[PDB]
Design a protein around this nucleic acid. Structure first.
Ligand SMILES: [Mg+2]
Ligand SMILES: [Mg+2]
Length: 474
RNA sequence: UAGGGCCC
RNA sequence: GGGCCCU
């Protein structure tokens, strides 16, 4: 986005800590080019002359403005995709009750009872459950009143900046490229869910290339679906954006919201409005108050869905900006926020597309930094999506989500106190797909100290999940 | 942490 | 209710 204002007000928003990630036994063994992100402005691992408070915000390099001509075309693209999207999902997009928004519905998990409540509740030591009853699905009086200012379109808010405590490439750690989470007030999340949760539920249940969205998918079983679909195209592209979330422009965002969440689609008129409040935002970080224009806040409700929608619209726009007679079926794609696979039988030229994406403030590069620029003839077994490759299972014939061994090693090398056992079992479900030897190796440093699920048991679990029938009558 | 999915 | 992984 564009930082239009940075100012000091006395009331310190308290965030920075030490990391909670301690190394495991495997760190000594794997020695990964990874480590926890810097959370302190004087972290010794930081390069000489780096300011964390700086780099943290260096993603806001502006809010690209679009011409009337470009705006109109983007609007047609957003209108065209909305049209495909709602034809598939239906138009059952009515608001959710307070209850529904809280407890979830068929396809949408419950709100999280004990995560960050946002501002100003954080500055009063109140916790989310002080404000909302998650057993019963009702709101306390401080939220009810806020709702009321939202039904009235007068509600105002600030985003709370948290540093993300997570593992990173060493290069990026040493650079101060710690990511930030933009925590919104829990009433804003609740109301957005009231406004677009039913839609979101429908998105999750219909995930797939037809709607170009993978939000709600489960890689273990969905890899077979996705694999077979993309297998049948002459060309497949793995496309990388740079700072996708932050570089959404005001115009793109506003127009998308106007085209996709129309009342004629069954949405409450305040769906558009609640969404639009994400365009111009105040961010609280320590003593600082950063006024930003443009960008998606990470960690507002529906953040991944909105990103997925924009991602679909950008591909359509970029191609139409270049070629003629380009329709929704000239290509196919699936997206999860910024992450995307695109495919087409047409010999599209993504190299030529750079400047068209550029018009929305977006910079596309090919996933393989290698040999410079987009090429033709790649297949699905060449690309990555959600940090997984599409490999063929030797024994069922189905595609399986395979994570790179360095990634797995990085992941196994660190954990939070008292969680190794749990984490091990989880990551095991991730590792099974790498095959029995590689599974044995990754887990070797844990032999004797923790319980390691057998390869066989996790393989059999996976088979039953991906096709109950190939368990049964094999 | 918005969320998705999984593990217990 | 706790945890993990991905976006
Ligand atoms: Mg990168
Ligand atoms: Mg990718």
């Amino acid at each position: 986005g564009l930082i239009v204002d940075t100012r000091d007000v006395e009331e310190r928003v308290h965030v920075m800590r030490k990391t909670k990630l301690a190394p495991t036994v495997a760190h000594g063994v794997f020695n990964p080019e990874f480590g926890p992100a810097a959370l302190s402005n004087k972290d010794p691992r930081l390069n000489e002359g780096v300011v964390l408070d700086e780099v943290i915000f260096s993603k806001h390099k502006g809010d690209t403005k679009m011409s009337a001509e470009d705006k109109a075309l983007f609007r047609r693209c957003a209108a065209d995709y909305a049209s495909r999207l709602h034809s598939v999902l239906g138009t059952a997009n009515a608001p959710l009750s307070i209850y529904e928004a809280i407890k979830g519905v068929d396809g949408l998990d419950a709100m999280e009872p004990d995560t960050a409540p946002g501002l100003p509740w954080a500055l009063q030591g109140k916790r989310r459950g002080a404000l909302i009853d998650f057993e019963n699905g009702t709101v306390g009086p401080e939220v009810e009143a806020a709702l009321k200012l939202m039904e009235k379109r007068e509600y105002k808010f600030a985003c709370q900046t948290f540093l993300k405590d997570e593992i990173r490439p060493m290069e990026k750690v040493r650079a101060g490229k710690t990511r930030i989470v933009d925590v919104l007030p829990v009433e804003h999340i609740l109301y957005t869910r009231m406004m677009i949760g039913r839609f979101c539920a429908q998105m999750h249940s219909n995930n797939g290339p037809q709607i170009g969205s993978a939000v709600g998918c489960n890689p273990d079983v969905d890899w077979q679906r996705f694999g077979t679909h993309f297998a049948q195209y002459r060309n497949v592209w793995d496309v990388d954006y740079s700072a996708f979330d932050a570089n959404h422009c005001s115009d793109a965002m506003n127009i998308m919201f106007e085209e996709v969440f129309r009342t004629e689609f069954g949405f409450h008129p305040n769906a558009e409005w609640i969404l639009k409040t994400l365009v111009n935002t105040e961010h609280a970080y320590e003593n600082k108050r950063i006024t930003v224009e443009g960008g998606m806040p990470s960690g507002c409700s529906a953040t991944s869905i909105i990103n997925t929608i924009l991602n679909n619209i950008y591909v359509l726009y970029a191609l139409r900006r270049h070629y003629e007679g380009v329709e929704l079926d000239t290509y196919t794609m699936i997206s999860y926020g910024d992450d995307i696979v695109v495919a087409s039988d047409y010999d599209l030229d993504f190299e030529a597309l750079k400047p068209h994406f550029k018009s929305l403030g977006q910079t596309i590069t090919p996933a393989d930094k290698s040999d410079k620029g987009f090429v033709l003839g790649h297949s699905i077994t060449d690309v990555t999506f959600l940090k997984r490759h599409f490999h063929m299972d030797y024994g069922t014939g189905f595609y399986k989500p395979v994570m790179a061994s360095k990634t797995l090693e990085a992941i196994l090398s660190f954990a939070r106190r008292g969680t190794i056992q749990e984490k091990l079992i989880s990551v095991a479900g991730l590792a099974v797909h790498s095959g029995p030897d590689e599974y044995r190796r990754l887990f070797e440093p844990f032999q004797g100290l923790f319980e390691i699920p057998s390869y066989r048991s996790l393989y059999l679990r996976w088979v039953n999940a991906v096709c109950g029938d190939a368990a049964a009558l094999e």
